[PDB]
């Protein structure tokens, strides 16, 4: 993606969405790769594109960091004078970035810099997620299931729990948590130079209480241990938000990962053949444009069984 | 084709064989020499030199003369530089290598050591197909490049490939070619042939043997032609290569032949070429020609973008009404978001199959019929979100209906007990028993 | 003067006073006499097209004299004996004067320089300051700047600057790196320096009677190279410093500027001569159709001096001599020109060269390539130092083990990556059975065995090393008379050929 951007000469007045997508792709690639110097990449195009897109989109801290990195790099003489001139020009610009662009880490509620080692935040040790079409951060968190609980009956039990947790007004935990969130609300914001701490704990739910207790435990231990959930929280959950990834078609029993979306308003679509996440807007637009899954390189579900003997 | 007749003029029917004879190992073959047709007879044998009789046909006299020809042994070819004490060490090492007596030969070579002697060591080790002594010698060259080649080549199941690589490192291409043919390996030989310079021979070998790396060979030949400044040959081998849509414009702009690029794009008549040329025209402030080439490339998003740059919304509206492109409508609605044209923006978002944005905007602005019409044709998630919003609204009956038409029917059943209706409740009961039977009929 | 060998139509501007200072901008024209300044404009900004006559926009008067006038496109700088001021040429409706530069010292600015967007001011105290036009801020400050500053000359964009200082000294300054660079072989009475619009690397210095040309090189291995280009007629015989090339200039003529290897020489009767420097002059003289061999060798020599490696490559391919091919390949390799070096070496007839060249073209990292080029071409210690300076010292350890020095390799391995101690130690074992020191082999092999037995992970390599070390102890114990242990450990080991060799 970034090479298809860079080889094309840039438009002086280009679309803001295209620039944002290119910046996100470059930042994600730089964060994920870092220093492995694998076969295929040159580590110069990414930095140059990130610098140009940041200069066009403020991003003063990232621009300075990538410009220093490129100064440590060697480039063809066509770009050196432009790079030094842009660096000296940006020297006069204010620091502290521009906000409203740094990714928001879930289970932390804190703001982190765009370039943070192997695509993880400083507050916790949790892997980020991105929609491959737009390379935009997704509001998703990872959780595990007890070995005693089996997934097949887990599905039916959580379905029954979601179904029962609506009409019966006797006792339910979901509506209790919703009402507690509506009644009591704590929202604090603190400003710093690079970071921002968001104290948003209005939603008092058993899941979030267990999450914050586990986060304090991990801070005490200074290590990462994935959260393990018991039957009560599992019953307290619903059906639409879960986005479990299965590798059963390749291996009948290898592993299974479970993810929860904090924001239920945003819809996410998970291709199980390639096990990749997408935003329904971009995924639907791409499917309408072409009937092939981009990373999966497989047929679309809406179409018929194209897999016949002739194609085989 | 004719590879056995013309070579017999200089080849004779006499071959020389060298042997070391002892009681322990009996007789062992050491080396073989092919005598040319000019060589008439074997004169004698000496340690540093071998002497033969050669005819003198060029003499005009009736009686042709005969001269002595002095030649070096295979292990002594090249070493012109003081041969007084080395012969003993070389003979001892070869003799001990005949029986593979490693340590005796190593301790015999210990006392002298010399880089030229070490390269002769490595050459004869390659000749005798021994690897450990060969890599030890390559360690003793202080030849870091050969060691790096060893390290990068050792990751190969075939030892013959490593031997051929060492032959390349020691500069005899014929032995490496023979080894590659012996091992039935052609890709490494194809790479070597591509490197050395005979590109056409490499192309022929690839097409008759591999045919897989043929595209790579074409690309490499095109790159070589580009280095040779042969623009026509470079572009030709680009179209015979796998990719030519992007390499040709890049080389043309590197050279600066704008008119040649124009001739090429007019001859090709391809949409990506039109898009590239229009983008370049817009970059160099040729707006009208860029618009014309965009029209020839059918990129309506670009016309909407350009007309939005100059705030010429009327022509953009006409274009989106005529072509009815989806992304053009999407970007037009994006502009209308800033332009304060919410109804038309929502309509265009609905047309562009972007459901959630339009339905969420209308839910904030309070439109009822449009959002349910959108959700009826939308996916399950949009249906759920819109009908939950309708639950949040003052009228819940329509939310019940949209659940009934939505993907969640147990929710409709539970609402049926909640609102304690009977007719719609019994219809929902019929629907839920239908879905239960549908699920039970799949597999049991 | 856009075109070559001909002069376009001149345009007349009317005046009634005779100024002693003249300044030219992209659009305006400034005429300055003592305490009087005149400004002229063409059309009204945008694109000229048709050009109108001289328009008197604003007559400017000063309390002091006008020492110097500068005008880039949009702002104008006026110098008086003690103070510099700024002005806007297009607008006169604005009643707010420009922010006056300088500080409480209020001393005369020794050096002033206008670029497209930046203003450089250098004071008599020896301090250079960078000023942003639209922001009006001091972005870059450098107070020490060696001993004392006399004269300054910036690039047309401000990327480079050259400072002439007391006792006839010269220095090069880069705002990005904020570090000075001393200069050598410079005349002490040169008055001006002209940059080249074609390439920022090349520039020229005007002595009172001679022209000197200099080039900045950053692609040179482990060095930023600045040197006066020499003249040489030897057939690759000598590569040593010599007299610099000097262009003979006529008496009382001032070249206006140098661009594309062409100098705008001005001579009386209003004559403009493009001429050429006597380094690119023979470059333009050579045609390459038939010519001769001495001329072709001179063309190759001057291309090598000017680093025109494409002309060097064509001059090489004309003459099939192998030594010239080797020299050109070595020079291109030393100037990190990978493609030219590969082509020259392939034309020479070597494959081991091109294998490593193609392997090197893969890596785009900086220190890794610098060290690899050093270790292929010349010395090895500098390559090791470069690799240590890089982020992959394991390559340096491998290179040191490759030379088998084993005096610095072991120390480096212990210093950086002590987890590879066993394998390298095994190599020492071979060396310690090469020198005949049988006893030391026992302890070296035993230490290696203990080290590899400590780590149980990845049992394949551990088992291979164990078998090899067991063979080593078996052979060294047999050689030392320890028959029982050697024959026993030969019994447990299973690899047949090694046991056969030990029995032999
Ligand atoms: Zn976190
Ligand atoms: Zn997929």
Author numbering:
A (entry chain A): 940 to 1251
B (entry chain D): 641 to 1084
C (entry chain E): 380 to 883
Quote from the publication.
In particular, IFT144, IFT140, IFT122 and IFT121, share the same domain organization, from the N- to the C-termini encompassing two tandem WD40 β-propellers (WDs), an array of 12 to 20 TPRs and, except for IFT140, a zinc binding domain (ZBD). These four subunits are distributed into the two modules; the head module consists of IFT140, IFT144 and the C-terminal half of IFT122 (IFT122C, 706-1246), whereas the base module consists of IFT121, the N-terminus of IFT122 (IFT122N, 1-705) as well as IFT139 and IFT43. Intriguingly, the N-terminal WD40 propellers together with the first four TPRs of both IFT140 and IFT144 in the head module are organized by pseudo-two-fold symmetry, in which a unique α-helical insertion between the second and the third TPRs in IFT140 and IFT144 allows TPRs at the junction to lock into a zigzagged configuration in both shape and electrostatic complementary manners. In the head module, the ~15-residue linkers between the second WD40 propeller and the first TPR in both IFT140 and IFT144 make a sharp turn such that the propellers of IFT140 and IFT144 point to opposite directions away from the central pseudo-two-fold axis in an elongated conformation. The C-terminal ZBD of IFT122 attaches to the other side of the IFT140-IFT144 TPR junction to constitute a compact core that is further encircled by the TPR array of IFT140, burying a total of ~2500 Å2 solvent exposed surface area. From this core extend out the TPR arms of IFT122, IFT140 and IFT144, the most variable segments in the head module. A frameshift mutation at Tyr1077 in human IFT122ZBD (equivalent to Lys1013 in Tetramymena IFT122ZBD) that would disrupt the head module core causes the severe Beemer-Langer syndrome with early infant death or Cranioectodermal dysplasia, highlighting the essential role of IFT122ZBD in organizing the head module core in IFT-A. Structural comparison shows that individual head and base modules are almost identical in these two states.
